[PDB]
């Protein structure tokens, strides 16, 4: 009864987080909710193996102690967790060593891999997602008045190649080679506050590959202001090393 990475057991809704749609429950089984010990959801993450969650480094600035954090796996509701959700304390924190906005959480016990809790697949090292590739972002963040608050949402957004995103009228030189951009130039659909650390995934042949980690933006869903994501492929070698050595 094993489950390959990147293959949801409930097919994602098409949906051609501000804007977008509410996901089918359990169609994004690698999505994590990151919480404090007695606190509510404040960031997302992506399960990448039974003991390891990838998130954004800035999600860890409230506390340098692993005991401050817990991960919720298999969830659909933001607050009223379903009976079968897995809640697991974090045992170790590893921040990316060149100060980029990406981090690994080691879980205190391995997640049980089920039809609702399945890791995402990592990309090949240094792969560059092509301009206009349609990808999906997911999370429980702010919706800015759009429907779906309190439920896991998704949005389908095209990647905008860095050379375009860095133009003066858009993000004006801010985006690094270890980041990527996604969104509609018209605005209206975006990751937002509370989505940080969660996944940006792109479908490839028969499975979803994790290509981005939700990081920052100039606001959310503004015209001419696409969201910025850490480019996961530039960190695969580092991630593999951390898992091998710890």
């Amino acid at each position: 009864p094993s489950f390959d990475c990147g293959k949801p057991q409930v097919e994602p809704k098409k949906c051609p987080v501000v804007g977008g749609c509410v996901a089918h429950p359990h169609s994004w089984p690698w999505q994590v909710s990151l919480r404090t010990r007695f606190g509510m959801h404040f960031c997302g993450g992506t399960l990448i193996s039974p003991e390891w969650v990838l998130t954004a480094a800035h999600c860890l600035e409230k506390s340098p102690r692993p005991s401050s954090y817990k991960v919720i796996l298999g969830a659909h509701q933001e607050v009223n967790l379903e009976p079968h959700v897995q809640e697991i304390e974090v045992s170790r924190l590893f921040l990316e060593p060149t100060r980029k906005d990406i981090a690994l959480l080691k879980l205190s016990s391995p997640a049980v891999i089920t039809d609702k809790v399945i890791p995402a697949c990592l990309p090949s090292p240094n792969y560059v997602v092509a301009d206009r590739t349609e990808c999906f972002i997911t999370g429980w963040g702010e919706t800015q008045g759009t429907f779906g608050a309190g439920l896991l949402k998704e949005a389908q957004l095209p990647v905008i190649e860095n050379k375009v995103c860095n133009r003066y009228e858009f993000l004006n030189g801010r985006v690094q080679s270890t980041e990527l951009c996604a969104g509609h130039l018209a605005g209206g659909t975006d990751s937002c506050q509370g989505d940080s650390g969660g996944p940006l995934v792109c479908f490839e042949k028969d499975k979803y590959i994790l290509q981005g980690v939700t990081s920052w933006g100039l606001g959310c869903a503004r015209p001419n202001k696409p969201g910025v994501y850490v480019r996961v492929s530039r960190f695969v070698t580092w991630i593999e090393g951390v898992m091998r050595n710890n």
Binding site: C59, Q193, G194, S215, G217
Partner: peptide, 14 residues
């Protein structure tokens, strides 16, 4: 103007 998308957001003057 940059804001990281945590709760609460971490924001910068640019």
């Amino acid at each position: 103007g940059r804001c990281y998308k945590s709760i609460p957001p971490i924001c910068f003057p640019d």
